[PDB]
């Protein structure tokens, strides 16, 4: 009607702490992302990835059309900074499409 309110989000981070680790293994990561959005993750003329990849050649990244998500798969080290890269534009392009006023 008007004069409406809500709010209760959701939140996490539970016992976190900036912990490391030192281990020569394969590590394969998942980042949950859209696939509506496919044609706009990817770019039109394949930019975003082929950046991206250019700067983390070790790093591969899998598309799901089912499964709805991202698989990474390289080095902790590396798929961590690319697994990153992404869940920041995912957002972005989110963000953008149905602008909340208030």
Do not use: C
Not at 31 to 41: D, E, G, T
Request: aromatic share 4%.
């Amino acid at each position: 009607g008007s004069s409406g309110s809500s709010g209760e989000p959701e939140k996490l981070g539970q016992a976190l702490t900036e912990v490391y680790a030192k281990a020569n293994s394969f590590t394969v990561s998942s980042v949950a992302a859209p696939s509506w959005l496919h044609r706009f993750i990817i770019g039109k003329k394949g930019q975003n990835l082929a950046k991206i990849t250019q700067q983390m050649p070790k790093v591969h990244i899998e598309f799901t059309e089912g499964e709805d998500k991202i698989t990474l798969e390289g080095p902790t080290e590396d798929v961590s900074v690319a697994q990153e890269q992404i869940e920041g534009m995912v957002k972005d392009l989110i963000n953008r499409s149905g602008p909340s006023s208030g």
